[PDB]
Amino acid sequence: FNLDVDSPAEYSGPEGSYFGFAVDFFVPSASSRMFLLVGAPKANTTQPGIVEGGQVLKCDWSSTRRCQPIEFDATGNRDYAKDDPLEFKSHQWFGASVRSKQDKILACAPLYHWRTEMKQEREPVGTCFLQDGTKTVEYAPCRSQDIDADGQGFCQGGFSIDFTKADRVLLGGPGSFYWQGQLISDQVAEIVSKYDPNVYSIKYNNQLATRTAQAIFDDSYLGYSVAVGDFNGDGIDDFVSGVPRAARTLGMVYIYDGKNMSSLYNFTGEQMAAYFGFSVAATDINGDDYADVFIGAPLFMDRGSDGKLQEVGQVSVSLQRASGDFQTTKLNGFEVFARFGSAIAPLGDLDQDGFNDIAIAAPYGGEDKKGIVYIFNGRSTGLNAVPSQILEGQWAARSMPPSFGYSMKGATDIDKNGYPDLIVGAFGVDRAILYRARPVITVNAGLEVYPSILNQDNKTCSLPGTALKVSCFNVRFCLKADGKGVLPRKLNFQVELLLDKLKQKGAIRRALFLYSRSPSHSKNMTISRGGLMQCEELIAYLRDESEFRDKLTPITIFMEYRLDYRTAADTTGLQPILNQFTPANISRQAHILLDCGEDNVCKPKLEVSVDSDQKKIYIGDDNPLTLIVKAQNQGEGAYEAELIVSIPLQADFIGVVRNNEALARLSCAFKTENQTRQVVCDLGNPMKAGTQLLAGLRFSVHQQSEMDTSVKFDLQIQSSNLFDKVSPVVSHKVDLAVLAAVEIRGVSSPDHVFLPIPNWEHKENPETEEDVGPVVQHIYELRNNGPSSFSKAMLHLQWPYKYNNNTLLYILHYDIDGPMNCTSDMEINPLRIKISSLDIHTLGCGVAQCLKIVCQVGRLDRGKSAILYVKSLLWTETFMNKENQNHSYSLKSSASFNVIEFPYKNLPIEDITNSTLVTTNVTWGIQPAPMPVPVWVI
Amino acid sequence: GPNICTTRGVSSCQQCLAVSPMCAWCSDEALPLGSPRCDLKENLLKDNCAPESIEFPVSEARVLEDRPLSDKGSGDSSQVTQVSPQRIALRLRPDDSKNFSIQVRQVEDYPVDIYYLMDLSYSMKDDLWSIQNLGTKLATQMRKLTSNLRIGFGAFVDKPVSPYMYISPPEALENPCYDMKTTCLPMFGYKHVLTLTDQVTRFNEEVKKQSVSRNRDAPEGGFDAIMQATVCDEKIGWRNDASHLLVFTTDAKTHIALDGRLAGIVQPNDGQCHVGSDNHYSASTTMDYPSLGLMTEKLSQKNINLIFAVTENVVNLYQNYSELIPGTTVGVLSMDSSNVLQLIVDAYGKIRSKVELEVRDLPEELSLSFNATCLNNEVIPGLKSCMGLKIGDTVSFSIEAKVRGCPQEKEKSFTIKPVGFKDSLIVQVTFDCDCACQAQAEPNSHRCNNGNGTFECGVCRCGPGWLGSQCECSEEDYRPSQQDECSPREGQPVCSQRGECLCGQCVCHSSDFGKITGKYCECDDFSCVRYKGEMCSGHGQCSCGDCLCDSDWTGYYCNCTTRTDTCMSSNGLLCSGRGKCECGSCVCIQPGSYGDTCEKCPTCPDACTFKKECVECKKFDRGALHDENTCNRYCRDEIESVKELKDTGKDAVNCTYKNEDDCVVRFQYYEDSSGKSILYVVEEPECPKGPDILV
Ligand SMILES: *[C@@H]1O[C@H](CO)[C@@H](O[C@@H]2O[C@H](CO)[C@@H](O[C@@H]3O[C@H](CO[C@H]4O[C@H](CO)[C@@H](O[C@H]5O[C@H](CO)[C@@H](O)[C@H](O)[C@@H]5O)[C@H](O)[C@@H]4O)[C@@H](O)[C@H](O[C@H]4O[C@H](CO)[C@@H](O)[C@H](O)[C@@H]4O)[C@@H]3O)[C@H](O)[C@H]2NC(C)=O)[C@H](O)[C@H]1NC(C)=O
Ligand SMILES: *[C@@H]1O[C@H](CO)[C@@H](O[C@@H]2O[C@H](CO)[C@@H](O[C@@H]3O[C@H](CO[C@H]4O[C@H](CO)[C@@H](O)[C@H](O)[C@@H]4O)[C@@H](O)[C@H](O[C@H]4O[C@H](CO)[C@@H](O)[C@H](O)[C@@H]4O)[C@@H]3O)[C@H](O)[C@H]2NC(C)=O)[C@H](O)[C@H]1NC(C)=O
Ligand SMILES: *[C@@H]1O[C@H](CO)[C@@H](O[C@@H]2O[C@H](CO)[C@@H](O[C@@H]3O[C@H](CO)[C@@H](O)[C@H](O)[C@@H]3O)[C@H](O)[C@H]2NC(C)=O)[C@H](O)[C@H]1NC(C)=O
Ligand SMILES: *[C@@H]1O[C@H](CO)[C@@H](O[C@@H]2O[C@H](CO)[C@@H](O[C@@H]3O[C@H](CO)[C@@H](O)[C@H](O)[C@@H]3O)[C@H](O)[C@H]2NC(C)=O)[C@H](O)[C@H]1NC(C)=O
Ligand SMILES: *[C@@H]1O[C@H](CO)[C@@H](O[C@@H]2O[C@H](CO)[C@@H](O)[C@H](O)[C@H]2NC(C)=O)[C@H](O)[C@H]1NC(C)=O
Ligand SMILES: *[C@@H]1O[C@H](CO)[C@@H](O[C@@H]2O[C@H](CO)[C@@H](O)[C@H](O)[C@H]2NC(C)=O)[C@H](O)[C@H]1NC(C)=O
Ligand SMILES: *[C@@H]1O[C@H](CO)[C@@H](O[C@@H]2O[C@H](CO)[C@@H](O)[C@H](O)[C@H]2NC(C)=O)[C@H](O)[C@H]1NC(C)=O
Ligand SMILES: *[C@@H]1O[C@H](CO)[C@@H](O[C@@H]2O[C@H](CO)[C@@H](O)[C@H](O)[C@H]2NC(C)=O)[C@H](O)[C@H]1NC(C)=O
Ligand SMILES: *[C@@H]1O[C@H](CO)[C@@H](O[C@@H]2O[C@H](CO)[C@@H](O)[C@H](O)[C@H]2NC(C)=O)[C@H](O)[C@H]1NC(C)=O
Ligand SMILES: *[C@@H]1O[C@H](CO)[C@@H](O)[C@H](O)[C@H]1NC(C)=O
Ligand SMILES: *[C@@H]1O[C@H](CO)[C@@H](O)[C@H](O)[C@H]1NC(C)=O
Ligand SMILES: *[C@@H]1O[C@H](CO)[C@@H](O)[C@H](O)[C@H]1NC(C)=O
Ligand SMILES: *[C@@H]1O[C@H](CO)[C@@H](O)[C@H](O)[C@H]1NC(C)=O
Ligand SMILES: [Ca+2]
Ligand SMILES: [Ca+2]
Ligand SMILES: [Ca+2]
Ligand SMILES: [Ca+2]
Ligand SMILES: [Ca+2]
Numbered sequence A: 001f002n003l004d005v006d007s008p009a010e011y012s013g014p015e016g017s018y019f020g021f022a023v024d025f026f027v028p029s030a031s032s033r034m035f036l037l038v039g040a041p042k043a044n045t046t047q048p049g050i051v052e053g054g055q056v057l058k059c060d061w062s063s064t065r066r067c068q069p070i071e072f073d074a075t076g077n078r079d080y081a082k083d084d085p086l087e088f089k090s091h092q093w094f095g096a097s098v099r100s101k102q103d104k105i106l107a108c109a110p111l112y113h114w115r116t117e118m119k120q121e122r123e124p125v126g127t128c129f130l131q132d133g134t135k136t137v138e139y140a141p142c143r144s145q146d147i148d149a150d151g152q153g154f155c156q157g158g159f160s161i162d163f164t165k166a167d168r169v170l171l172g173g174p175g176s177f178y179w180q181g182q183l184i185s186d187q188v189a190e191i192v193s194k195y196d197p198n199v200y201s202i203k204y205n206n207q208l209a210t211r212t213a214q215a216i217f218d219d220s221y222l223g224y225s226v227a228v229g230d231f232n233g234d235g236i237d238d239f240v241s242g243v244p245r246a247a248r249t250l251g252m253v254y255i256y257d258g259k260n261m262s263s264l265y266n267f268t269g270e271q272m273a274a275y276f277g278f279s280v281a282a283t284d285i286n287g288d289d290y291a292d293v294f295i296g297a298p299l300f301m302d303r304g305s306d307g308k309l310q311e312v313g314q315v316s317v318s319l320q321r322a323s324g325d326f327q328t329t330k331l332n333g334f335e336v337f338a339r340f341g342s343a344i345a346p347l348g349d350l351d352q353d354g355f356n357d358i359a360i361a362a363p364y365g366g367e368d369k370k371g372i373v374y375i376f377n378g379r380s381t382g383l384n385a386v387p388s389q390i391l392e393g394q395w396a397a398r399s400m401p402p403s404f405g406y407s408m409k410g411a412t413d414i415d416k417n418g419y420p421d422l423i424v425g426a427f428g429v430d431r432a433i434l435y436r437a438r439p440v441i442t443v444n445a446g447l448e449v450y451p452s453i454l455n456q457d458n459k460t461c462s463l464p465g466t467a468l469k470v471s472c473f474n475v476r477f478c479l480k481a482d483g484k485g486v487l488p489r490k491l492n493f494q495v496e497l498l499l500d501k502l503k504q505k506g507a508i509r510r511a512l513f514l515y516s517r518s519p520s521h522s523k524n525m526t527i528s529r530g531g532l533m534q535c536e537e538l539i540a541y542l543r544d545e546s547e548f549r550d551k552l553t554p555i556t557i558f559m560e561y562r563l564d565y566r567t568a569a570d571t572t573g574l575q576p577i578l579n580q581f582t583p584a585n586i587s588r589q590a591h592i593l594l595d596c597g598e599d600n601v602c603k604p605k606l607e608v609s610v611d612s613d614q615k616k617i618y619i620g621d622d623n624p625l626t627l628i629v630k631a632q633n634q635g636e637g638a639y640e641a642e643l644i645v646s647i648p649l650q651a652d653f654i655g656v657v658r659n660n661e662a663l664a665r666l667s668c669a670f671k672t673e674n675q676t677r678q679v680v681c682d683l684g685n686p687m688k689a690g691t692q693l694l695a696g697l698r699f700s701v702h703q704q705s706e707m708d709t710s711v712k713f714d715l716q717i718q719s720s721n722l723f724d725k726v727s728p729v730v731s732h733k734v735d736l737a738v739l740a741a742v743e744i745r746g747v748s749s750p751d752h753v754f755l756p757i758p759n760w761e762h763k764e765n766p767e768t769e770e771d772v773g774p775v776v777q778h779i780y781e782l783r784n785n786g787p788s789s790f791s792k793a794m795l796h797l798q799w800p801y802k803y804n805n806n807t808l809l810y811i812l813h814y815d816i817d818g819p820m821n822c823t824s825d826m827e828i829n830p831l832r833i834k835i836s837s838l839d840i841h842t843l844g845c846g847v848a849q850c851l852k853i854v855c856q857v858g859r860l861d862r863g864k865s866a867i868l869y870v871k872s873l874l875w876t877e878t879f880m881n882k883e884n885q886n887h888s889y890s891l892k893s894s895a896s897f898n899v900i901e902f903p904y905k906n907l908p909i910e911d912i913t914n915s916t917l918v919t920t921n922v923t924w925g926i927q928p929a930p931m932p933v934p935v936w937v938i
Numbered sequence B: 001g002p003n004i005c006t007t008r009g010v011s012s013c014q015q016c017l018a019v020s021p022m023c024a025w026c027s028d029e030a031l032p033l034g035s036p037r038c039d040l041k042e043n044l045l046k047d048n049c050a051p052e053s054i055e056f057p058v059s060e061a062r063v064l065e066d067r068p069l070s071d072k073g074s075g076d077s078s079q080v081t082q083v084s085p086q087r088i089a090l091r092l093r094p095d096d097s098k099n100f101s102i103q104v105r106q107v108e109d110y111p112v113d114i115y116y117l118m119d120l121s122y123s124m125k126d127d128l129w130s131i132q133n134l135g136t137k138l139a140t141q142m143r144k145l146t147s148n149l150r151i152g153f154g155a156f157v158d159k160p161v162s163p164y165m166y167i168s169p170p171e172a173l174e175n176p177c178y179d180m181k182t183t184c185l186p187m188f189g190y191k192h193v194l195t196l197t198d199q200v201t202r203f204n205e206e207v208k209k210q211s212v213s214r215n216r217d218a219p220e221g222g223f224d225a226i227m228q229a230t231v232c233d234e235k236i237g238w239r240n241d242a243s244h245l246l247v248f249t250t251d252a253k254t255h256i257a258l259d260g261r262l263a264g265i266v267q268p269n270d271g272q273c274h275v276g277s278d279n280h281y282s283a284s285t286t287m288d289y290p291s292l293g294l295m296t297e298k299l300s301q302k303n304i305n306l307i308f309a310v311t312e313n314v315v316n317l318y319q320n321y322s323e324l325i326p327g328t329t330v331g332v333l334s335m336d337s338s339n340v341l342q343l344i345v346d347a348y349g350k351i352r353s354k355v356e357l358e359v360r361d362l363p364e365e366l367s368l369s370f371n372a373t374c375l376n377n378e379v380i381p382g383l384k385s386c387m388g389l390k391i392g393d394t395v396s397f398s399i400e401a402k403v404r405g406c407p408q409e410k411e412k413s414f415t416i417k418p419v420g421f422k423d424s425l426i427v428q429v430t431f432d433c434d435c436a437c438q439a440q441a442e443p444n445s446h447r448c449n450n451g452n453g454t455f456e457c458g459v460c461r462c463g464p465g466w467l468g469s470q471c472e473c474s475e476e477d478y479r480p481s482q483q484d485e486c487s488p489r490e491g492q493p494v495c496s497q498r499g500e501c502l503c504g505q506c507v508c509h510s511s512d513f514g515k516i517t518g519k520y521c522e523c524d525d526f527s528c529v530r531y532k533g534e535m536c537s538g539h540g541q542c543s544c545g546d547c548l549c550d551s552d553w554t555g556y557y558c559n560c561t562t563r564t565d566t567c568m569s570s571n572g573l574l575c576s577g578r579g580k581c582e583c584g585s586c587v588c589i590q591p592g593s594y595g596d597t598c599e600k601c602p603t604c605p606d607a608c609t610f611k612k613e614c615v616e617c618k619k620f621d622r623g624a625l626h627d628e629n630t631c632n633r634y635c636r637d638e639i640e641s642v643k644e645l646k647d648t649g650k651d652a653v654n655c656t657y658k659n660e661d662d663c664v665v666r667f668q669y670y671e672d673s674s675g676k677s678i679l680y681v682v683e684e685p686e687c688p689k690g691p692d693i694l695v
């Protein structure tokens, strides 16, 4: 929030050069000075016969915004043979990517083309150049004897690059192996060491490289983006890389080990085509010494308020944990088609609060699509998702969008002050802009009125002009200011005081300053350094009783303060900033002495009490709970009286009830000033004597877990009186209960079977389902609806297996869904009938031969279920009653359950039992018409 | 007595209106400093104050144009109309609403444009061959569904640039295919061949002239083609009153936006047309591929129906993309495009079965609510979309437009139309929240009594620190009197505590981190209900402890969304046609069903029980569906009538039931017949047998 946007340093290259496409700081160890490096990938150069070879520029910060090209390669193309170029430098996009570490700087031409040494080709292998003072070496890992699209021919190495702690280059080649992509890493020492200009394919010794893979992985673009950071516990920076076309354009982010090119973690996008992986960053955002991953997916479409897709871009934020499981959250852009996740630039600690910060760019955003950069501050929790500052693009398009924010670099305090600065690149207008961080200061304002309660009769000090005396009191403000980094010692503050703030608005001015006789007063104050809480006093008097009529309202003393801008800045006008989460004013208040008895001191008697409206809070979900509170003052008037109901912050506050005239509708607010967890309600400023209040405060307690047996609220009234200023604290238990509306239900998919059974005949020893009869599915479902979960249950199925000695419904196979095992007390499928390819009327286990299936159910949570799929065949033979013809049979199975255990082992429980029966009715439908005495035949 | 208007809107005329649609004001001291201002209307009228004085402006929704809905499509002379009211003038007063309706029709014999945009990668040479027959072959089928048709043609094969194209390793390879004993034309990108002509014969002619090219890289640049075919509407020649089909046929993966960076193409797609006199997409080699979002807004703006005719190997891909580009259809193409005909025909019926409204340029502070009537007279609420339809059908929608407060002094227009339709309802909104006497009001010191204050509409406010019915007492030192009918009942409370009773009114002294209005210090601007952190769940403004919700939010807390897409399933139907959508979440109905969209129901009865009532419906003219008259809508499975079923080794499901004639009907069910479901019935149900011994 402290980037100076009034006077940032502005740099520019030649038009059409894409000056600004890549940016970085240059911090050489050989010099006290620092520069900034701007990549200009379309820049024309003096290289013989080469159009738009591109270049990189070293830019002076030491005043003079002039930039000089770094002379990496002044030569044109080499020759395979005479009038037969070995390489093609024109249009190579050299300067498309730029990174430096200490004296070393790496620049790449990812569109550098290369004739093979076998066939006459034009293959974009890409190349880089590493400089150190005057020494320059070419590093072109992909330019090897692996020479086509199936090899590294179309590698475009140098598309993205990075230096590791230690010293070693990570390089991205998104075209290697049919555009699978490639990461290659090399020791900086090695590159310079093994460099030989007479060899075009140099083999570095400790090279690490990702290998070719299967053809599904083609066109993934590994190494499109790149970032470095430690993830496998400790040791060296490991390799992070965006793979934007991975997983069917879902996109992925791969992380490889730094020691070898071993895979550690993958990330995957939620939305195809969104370019998850366009940009990646690693930086410890929560100050726990663990690098955290950020992934840009700039074409993401979140869902609008209407419900409709809209391209806003999204950034993923994965917090690393010592375990290994990242703790991820999402961050959506704010404008449609402003490409929010385009560039993620770690800033280090931009404001020096103790946590790192980060800048995310939406380079086609802002009114007139000039480009925006959002800056987000880190915190112990994670990144603060509400951006603390918005850097606005300044230059309008010539034709192509200016693309401000398309590239960025931070983390380098380019001037003296101990705050990192930021480079933003705007390549569409051939500009780059350095924003430099302002110093932050923390002020601690004090205010006090030594005589708090004002007695109108006590007229001690005399009014200056007149010859009479007045009831006056003392007002004293004070300022202690301090801040890290380079900033001045003499800090000027414009302080302003106001008597009776909530009254000047139209009404009478009940208190004035002694010498001015005005409610308003100023003071040019000049504190310094840090600690020296510099003070200044003023005596203010109170008007004569003879007509300000109000004597009950408090007299609020208001103090505000502002810094002076230019009297504070350094030499080049870098004005300091106040800490954004620090209010620039404070309030205290006096009360006219009224009642309080003969002793002139007000002694209240505060009492608070509550009762259980609803005695139960059922575990496992959110639960509405309102408690009635009776706050009464039986003593004298209590000043600034307010109820402090400290709630167990496994609970939230909805509001005071306004559904009942029996309860008072108090003024309340929730807060947590470190460790506290409370709603604070106003009981009247002077809560007068005998004023009993009744109020309802509604809450919702979420408590899903098996914590304490109850949940506790503590409440007490408190006031600003010198004596008897609080009530006793009063606890209030609320009993956690268990409730699990568990139900069982079942079905028979063919609920009936009509017995003219088509294409059936008797088989002595049958195989197959066809030969036995139709399939009858009996699905049984136990489901826990109830809020509370259960940890164990038992399921019992009774299956009508045989009637007399005839095999009714024959079970082929049963299946299970959910936390449940089952056992049949009888061998299922005794006859090995295999195929799959997927009391006359009622016959139950009472009158039939019973097959039992017991099941052991695990933990079913709220809204979960266990399911038994029993696939059976109807044994037709039987129903062709050789006894005599037929009759309608209702084949009934039944399933019961009993819940035996709960995870809330310290709380009243109760076994839950119920059952269902599902039925399969076998009838004929087609049956004899009238006929007298004859009999049947087969 | 004092009611709402009295307690709040007695400060002025605008305040009186701003309070509620119930309120009304007086003019020209009708009851000279009497007592009651605003109150209601009948009450104020009952107190004499009556004539050119009422100031009670009613809201309105006058229909300005409503031509009738058409019967034929090709039958012109009279311009074709598919939306019954075309423009409708709305006047809303503050915090007020008016409802209206719109009848959308799927018009018979509506004309159709068909632009055939095809991949011409080497793999498509055998496709191109069998397409020559298409055109006249397509013309004879479309003859059925439509009269006036015209078709065109365009082809694509990715950007002719150094990564995708064969750079130029030898110069001979600029005309590729030298590599493999044959010839093919150079890479082109997007080539518009035929503008939409009704001379079908010339389609066959031009397609025969075409020939394939070759690409090094697997994914191709169709999205350039899709974008340019969409927005070069002069070149392609889409008509206004006609259905637009953009048949996009490919057998490959596709490049997407941001791929172009590898090529050094770092300029985003501008959305404009770039196909000149040479009929080639000239931006191809300088502009990046368009993003799905950009493709979506231009397809929608030019009412183009993108049809994905893709091959099996790559169908899942374009199904997922299609799903990110709502309205788009996708069908399985042959290896040689044999089946294109039917895919186009199938796609047409697909995209004319549905009708969903759209809203453009909706004023920020206005909010809309939809009920849908699409089957008989059944109104399903909170729905702006309707499906399962067929050409000839007319659906209806009920709309409610509500304003929040008093927006800008400017008449604003917005449009409600069906996706892909030419016709539309245009809604001119004027915000009527200023009294007629507002302008006729000069404060300038005097005129409001023997003092210096400000005057208007039959009453006056005195300047900073005065007030009073006429104009008295600047700043207390005088107050000692009056007392006022301050708190109702006069039980002693002054001005809701936070405020002092002066001059026959209150002075709400507080300014506690916000506003504080109301003539008894009635209203808090801040003290409101909390859902979690923010005031109205961070989705509403507050007044007197009442949440006024943002557009697309409802309920006392403003935590209930009005979205339905979260209740939608890939099924198509809302809450799996098994529940109701409440705050973008399905509350499941009695079938014992669950899941986010009620999709899961293992204990539900089998398909048989749901199909039979539609067999009994369709083939026997009986049943529940027959009685509700929902047969023709609720099931368009093809019920054929076999004499015998078969153990065919396929997706068979034998369902049998006893009908009310007491005969056993038997029918098998067959899904996945190329993504569609047919239903066979044994034509000889099994019945009882009465004496038939030759008699
Ligand atoms: C993060 O995600 C990424 C990708 O999303 C993961 O990366 C993938 O991880 C896979 C699992 O390790 C890798 O697959 C393995 O590849 C090796 C070596 O492949 C080479 O050799 C193959 C033949 O041996 C050859 O392919 C032939 O065989 C294929 C069979 O799969 C055929 O499909 C193909 O047509 C070819 O004929 C390749 O070309 C390579 O040259 C295999 O040895 C592995 O096989 C393993 O599993 C099989 C199971 O059947 C088993 O028998 C073997 O004994 C062996 O254990 C396996 O296929 C994949 O290459 C890799 N892709 C990329 C781009 O990285 C990554 O793992 C993941 N990491 C994290 C942290 O989640
Ligand atoms: C680095 O330095 C080089 C100089 O070597 C510059 O390269 C040339 O720049 C020019 C201008 O940008 C290129 O443009 C040429 O313009 C012609 C079209 O423009 C005319 O017509 C339009 C109407 O549409 C008029 O408005 C306008 O006034 C012009 O009269 C093209 O027809 C030219 O074609 C020629 O170049 C192509 C390049 O592929 C080749 O096929 C042939 O040589 C052909 O004759 C031409 O494009 C010109 O192309 C550039 N030459 C090249 C490619 O090297 C760079 O602009 C400069 N860049 C920077 C960053 O400074
Ligand atoms: C918007 O917020 C309100 C409250 O802030 C939500 O309403 C609350 O919903 C809970 C949970 O259902 C209600 O509790 C109880 O729910 C059970 C369901 O098993 C029901 O049987 C009980 O009768 C009881 O209602 C609770 O009443 C209610 N909170 C209160 C006190 O109003 C609401 O759901 C939120 N809107 C959404 C859906 O985002
Ligand atoms: C399959 O066949 C069985 C066996 O008959 C059917 O069960 C019967 O279902 C009927 C209707 O649901 C029940 O009728 C009710 O009986 C009770 C008596 O307890 C009576 O109070 C009600 O008025 C009603 O008549 C009946 O309970 C039950 N059979 C018996 C006698 O227990 C089943 O419904 C059939 N399913 C199909 C496919 O229709
Ligand atoms: C590359 O290094 C990593 C660690 O830096 C190796 O990971 C361990 O390998 C050993 C031996 O196979 C295993 O016992 C460990 O379980 C691995 N650690 C893990 C993943 O927990 C990896 O094997 C090395 N691979 C190569 C290519 O040398
Ligand atoms: C009567 O009021 C006077 C103020 O008008 C009080 O005198 C001040 O008391 C405070 C502490 O209460 C001291 O810090 C100030 O220095 C006193 N001001 C002076 C020196 O006049 C006084 O306390 C009141 N009565 C008594 C005797 O306590
Ligand atoms: C005094 O500082 C307070 C904050 O302590 C300011 O009041 C508002 O504070 C909120 C956050 O709580 C800010 O968002 C607003 O900017 C503040 N409102 C106003 C009126 O500016 C306030 O700025 C200061 N009071 C005055 C008017 O001097
Ligand atoms: C078992 O579940 C049944 C549900 O069938 C519960 O009974 C319901 O409520 C009453 C009183 O028990 C019954 O008369 C109804 O038939 C049931 N309602 C229905 C049909 O949904 C019953 O509470 C449970 N019993 C046990 C043993 O826990
Ligand atoms: C759609 O139907 C409902 C009918 O339920 C219309 O309005 C609702 O009607 C009742 C009370 O009047 C309640 O269900 C809701 O509170 C009403 N909704 C509101 C606040 O308007 C609804 O307006 C219909 N939609 C249209 C535009 O006709
Ligand atoms: C406040 O101090 C400045 C000097 O920095 C001066 O210009 C100004 O006159 C002072 N104002 C007052 C209170 O006189
Ligand atoms: C609004 O409600 C319905 C629209 O379906 C209609 O019957 C009724 O006439 C309308 N009422 C008003 C406010 O005019
Ligand atoms: C595409 O098809 C659907 C819709 O998203 C779904 O099954 C799946 O997400 C996708 N399948 C692929 C290509 O993985
Ligand atoms: C307001 O009226 C008084 C009459 O008492 C007069 O003296 C004064 O000049 C007037 N002020 C204006 C509006 O000029
Ligand atoms: Ca490591
Ligand atoms: Ca961390
Ligand atoms: Ca920080
Ligand atoms: Ca700095
Ligand atoms: Ca006392």
Ligand SMILES: [Ca+2]
Binding pocket: B123, B124, B125, B126, B127, B251, B335, B336
């Ligand atoms: Ca083909």
